[PDB]
Every structure is written in structure tokens, then in C-alpha cells.
Amino acid sequence: TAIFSDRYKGQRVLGKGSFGEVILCKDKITGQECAVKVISKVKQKTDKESLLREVQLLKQLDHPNIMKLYEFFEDKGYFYLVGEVYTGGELFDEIISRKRFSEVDAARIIRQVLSGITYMHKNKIVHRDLKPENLLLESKSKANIRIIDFGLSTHFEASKKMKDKIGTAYYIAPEVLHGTYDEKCDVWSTGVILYILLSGCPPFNGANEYDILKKVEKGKYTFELPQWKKVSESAKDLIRKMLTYVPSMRISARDALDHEWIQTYTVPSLDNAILNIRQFQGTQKLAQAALLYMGSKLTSDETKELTAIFKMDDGQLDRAELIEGYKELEHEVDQVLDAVDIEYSEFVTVAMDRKTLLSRERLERAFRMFDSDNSGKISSTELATIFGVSDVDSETWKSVLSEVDKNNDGEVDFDEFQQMLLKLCGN
């Protein structure tokens, strides 16, 4: 009965989310700001009665390391999950900005994650999809960590699209892959995050999604990297208990809080681990940005559908007709007409070019951030890692690279990298 739009109004986009987009919304009466995830009816893993009883329980739970869920709405085409706003950004984006990072800083982070998990397991809730992207900070500083999507992510079907799958294979418990899993899968995922905090490298890695999942399924890893020599044996011992293969023999979330490592450490800088987490995060973010650029190019579909609507027609249209044309597919129309002042062809051309330039700018920021030595280029070896994480076939991107520039000599600048992505999405 209760309608979302009768209570909240959208303000601005907050970012991407699993199963849906996240919008900053404001209560039309009290002015309370809220984070709203909009899930487009994404298949349902359970019946409607199971989702209602889970949401009812989740709304009553309260922990400082768990995101607060306020409301839940549903209409013919979407589900709306209304919760609290956390403005500190993603945890790993904060870690890469720091000059120093020690074993105390890592233990302080992992104590908060484990506190949240222990509390949710007491209430029979399983996350399953715990990963760095679901660890948000209340403020942008070295701040309380809030775990996102705890108990919600499992009621919806996992997206098969690589844009949503990037940064997930590293953290999934092996038993989740084979189908029989319980709350112990959340301890495995935290054990993987702890391994990355102390070395900057994932324990289970590979050239592509499937190669990572093969390493996870075997469950073998090592502490044989120069970084690990500067880490205590108490940290390595906790990681071993957390990354125990058989779930019944794996340590509980509660017993991990009571581990000597967490009690002792909650301080030499792990310099090589910071350099590696920066490279890891840069790679993940540029692969995501590359997929969202290709996604936005195919969507901008919008240019073809808007032309067939604007039926509505001298090669010219009034201001009100252009507003009606956009609403079928007010301030945004005036910003396009400002650069012009009109013909409907020049309006769509100026509006499309405005969305193209802004799409190019988000990709460019990710490219610049990946290019940490400010060389202006990325090597063929770096392209192989980026296209590996984004699941673009080796022969396909190498052919496209030769088409863009026959004399590339194993490197690409931003313009060339952008040209490669256009050809990889039919442009």
C-alpha cells in the first residue's frame, strides 16, 4: 500500500550497488537524508513471504558495524531498500590515501568487521558476499566501518554481468561455490580481506575470473612473499584458522575476536603492502570504469529511441516539446539550450556530446589514478591484467589494439585506451 515516491524524493546519485543503483534521497516532511537502493524486478531466490520476514528482522537489528535499514517498499517493477547514509567512502579507497599502514591499523579494521559479523551470526543472518566494496566508512579518515548488504544480498539472484561480478571471486568461500554453506563462509571472506590488508595481494589470484575461482576451490595459498617476513606469526596463525577449508573445522567469528592477535594489536609500517593495495585497487577501479564506459556507450539506445519519439514533429521543435520528449523517455533541457541559444537534431547532438564528454572524464580519472608514475601510458602487460579482471578475451583486445594503432610498440596512452574500449562495444 505505502508508496516510496509519496515519502522520498531523489537528490543525487551516491554510486553503484549490488542488485541495483544507490540514490541519495530526502524525506519530503522531516528532511532526513537516506541511501536508497533501487532493485529492478534481478530474479528472486525465495518467495515474497521469506523476503518480508527477513526485512522485518533486519529492521529491528542494531550494531555500530552493521548498516542500518529503515524501510522497504515494492511496486510492480522495483524494490526499494531505504537505509542510513555513510559519507566516508569505501575502506580500501581510504587505505590507499594513507602514508603509513601497520599491523595495528589492520587489526583495528578486522576487529570492527568481526564484531559486526559475530552479532549477525547470533541473529542467524549470513552475508555470503562480504568484500571490501561492502565495507563503508562513516567519515573519510583512519572511523567506524559499516558492513553493507548483510542478509539482503542472498535474497536476490547474483548478476551474471561482469560489471557487477568484478571484485567478487577473490572473497567467496569454496563451499559457497559447491552449494552447501552456512555462517562460516563469512569468516573465510574476512580471512581473505585480512590477507590483503597485511600483504596487499589476494591469497587466491589469477589472470581472469575462472582462474581465481580454481585457486579458491583448491583452497591452497602461501605466506611465501617478501612482504610476509615483516608480519607477526600471530597474524599468520589467525589467517590459517580463518582460511581453514572444511567449514566445521574453521574458527567462528566470535573465536576470531578472542584470538591473541586481535587482543594484542587492538608498529612498523607495511610499506610494500600499501604499494600493492594501491596497485590492486587501481586495477580493480580502472577495470570497473572501463566496463561502465562501454556500458554507458551502448546505453547512449537512448539516442536512437529519443529520435523516434521526437512522431512528435520544419526540422524544429519548441522548448515545451523537447521537455515532453525527454519526459516520455526541465533544468537539464535549459543547460543544453544555453550553449545553443533551435533544431531538434542540434539539441540531441549537443545533449549526446555533453554525456559523451562526461563519460570520457570518469574513465580518464580512473586511467590517471592507475598511472601512478605519471608516465601517461599503460603497458601491454598492464592491459592484460586490466582486460583479465574485466573478462575481455586476449586475442580480441590485441586485435582491437592493432586496429587503433599498428605501431603501438606495447603501450597505449589514454586516447588510445579509450579508442580500444569503443571498438570493444561496437563503436
Ligand X SMILES: Cc1cccc(-c2nc(N)sc2-c2ccc3ncccc3n2)c1
- Residue closer to ligand X by CB (options 86, 195) is 86
Q: Look at the alpha carbons of 201, 202, 205, 209 in this order and tell me if their dihedral is positive or negative.
A: negative
Shortest CB 67 distance to ligand X, Å: 6
List, as residue ranges, the binding site for ATP: 37
Give the span between the Cα atoms of 235 and 253, in whole angstroms: 15
Shortest CB 22 distance to ligand X, Å: 4
147-206 residues in contact with ligand X (CB under 6 A) are: 148-149, 152
Binding-residue pattern over the window 238 to 277 for ligand X, x denoting contact by CB under 6 A = ----------------------------------------
Per-position b or e across 176-190, b if 16+ CB within 10 A of its CB: beeeebebbbbbbbb
Instruction: Yes or no: say if 52 and 166 are a contact pair by the CB < 8 Å rule.
Output: no
Q: Is 401 in the site for ligand X (CB under 6 A)?
A: no
- Contacts of residue 207, defined as CB under 8 A and 6 or more positions apart, other chains included, come to 384, 385, 388
Binding-residue pattern over the window 77 to 106 for ligand X, x denoting contact by CB under 6 A = ----x-x-xxx-------------------
Q: Is 127 in the site for ligand X (CB under 6 A)?
A: no
Determine the 3-state secondary structure of 65 from DSSP: coil
- Contacts of residue 96, defined as CB under 8 A and 6 or more positions apart, other chains included, come to 274, 277, 278, 281, 282
- Residue closer to ligand X by CB (options 143, 384) is 143
339-398 residues in contact with ligand X (CB under 6 A) are: none
Strands 20-27 and 69-74 come out as unpaired
Give burial (CB, 10 Å; 0-12/13-18/19+) of 81.
Answer: buried
Please pick, from the candidates 14, 42, 143, 337, the single residue that binds ligand X as defined by CB under 6 A. Answer: 14
In this structure, what DSSP letter does residue 247 have?
Answer: G
Shortest CB 19 distance to ligand X, Å: 8
Question: Count residues contacting ligand X (CB under 6 A)?
Answer: 18
Binding-residue pattern over the window 30 to 49 for ligand X, x denoting contact by CB under 6 A = -----xxx------------
Give the span between the Cα atoms of 332 and 150, in whole angstroms: 37
Give the span between the Cα atoms of 124 and 120, in whole angstroms: 6
Amino acid at 137: L
Strands 135-137 and 78-83 come out as unpaired
Region near ligand X per CB under 6 A, out of 10-18, 115-123, 254-262, 270-278 = 10-18
Give the span between the Cα atoms of 295 and 362, in whole angstroms: 13
Please identify which of the residues 105, 129, 149, 164 carries the catalytic annotation.
129
129 catalytic? Reply is yes
- Residue closer to ligand X by CB (options 22, 366) is 22
Output phi, psi for 34, to 5 deg.
Answer: -140, 150
Q: Is 18 in the site for ligand X (CB under 6 A)?
A: yes
- Residue closer to ligand X by CB (options 135, 336) is 135
List, as residue ranges, the binding site: 37, 313-314, 316, 321, 341, 343, 346, 371, 373, 375, 377, 382, 405, 407, 409, 411, 416
Region near ligand X per CB under 6 A, out of 16-24, 259-267, 299-307, 351-359 = 16-24
What residues act catalytically? 129
* Residues of the shown chain interacting with ligand X in the complex, contacts defined by CB under 6 A: 14-15, 17-18, 22, 35-37, 69, 81, 83, 85-87, 136, 148-149, 152
